[PDB]
Symmetry: C2
Subunit: 109 residues, 2 copies
């Protein structure tokens, strides 16, 4: 059920994202190209804080997690928990973000 994913820090593009993302959010798996897609497919009141929070924590190399309403292609919202581990390269600089997205619908019933 967990959806694995990884983001290239330099380009901010998705290296990969599990196919379960399609069953969960409906958008074609191949449509998840970059962080911009992740930021767009989110509830308006959540975009208001999640993006800034994740950016700040990532830049500081601090692992983090956020709960928000993800936008399904059909228009309804799905509660998701995004858990992020920050990876640094040999020189100590942020190189990528790796983690999982979890459907936490049951926690909101």
């Amino acid at each position: 059920k967990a959806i694995p994913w990884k983001i290239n820090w330099q380009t901010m593009a998705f290296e990969y994202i599990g196919p379960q993302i399609e069953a969960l959010l409906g958008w074609p798996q191949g449509s998840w190209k970059s962080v911009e897609d992740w930021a767009t497919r989110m509830h308006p009141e959540d975009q208001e804080w999640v993006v800034n929070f994740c950016v700040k924590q990532s830049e500081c190399g601090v692992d983090h997690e956020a709960d928000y309403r993800a936008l399904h292609r059909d228009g309804h919202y799905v509660w998701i928990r995004d858990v992020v581990h920050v990876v640094r390269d040999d020189s100590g600089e942020v190189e990528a973000l790796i983690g999982f997205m979890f459907d936490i619908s049951l926690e909101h019933h």
Copy 2:
């Protein structure tokens, strides 16, 4: 709260594991040396299936997750969900396991 970790498939040793593992399970963070430690610090009825399940799924390169009672150093058990992503090298062979351990105590109250 999530505990990040990674295992070198060849040596089956922990490359790293978040410091939160100490606050959660009590054992010194540096004590988590290999899969053997992970397998030992688990409820006896769970060791009976979790180890075999994870091994089988990992060898097949299939992401998986398992819920089990982890052993705290003080002797009591803590419900944990281990989520695993399998990483393959350039030749297509299993190279490592990366994921997170989550305290799911609230789901068992």
